Design a protein around this ligand. Sequence first.
Ligand SMILES: [Cl-]
Length: 111
Amino acid sequence: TGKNVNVEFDKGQNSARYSGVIKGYDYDTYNFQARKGQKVHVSISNEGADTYLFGPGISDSVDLSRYSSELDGNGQYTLPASGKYELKVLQTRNEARKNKAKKYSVNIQIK
Ligand SMILES: [Cl-]
């Protein structure tokens, strides 16, 4: 529940950048369709916000943040199935406690 943004790329691009404001425990969701074997890379401008991926072939979630052990050497994660994924942007639990609004910018690249 909360913001949903269907990720639409345009033209000849393989990435799109989005912005949001989330307060406390609220989260924003970015939906996209992808083919198994494609690689996703997500960057975020605010270290107080996590970026978690949900979808087919993923039992719980994948942490796509920059220091996540789930990324390869190029900062990418390989999507294990074809279908609809969700990237959620939420505050860390330690930050969420403060019930403050944070702005963020997220870049979503699917290759
Ligand atoms: Cl960024």
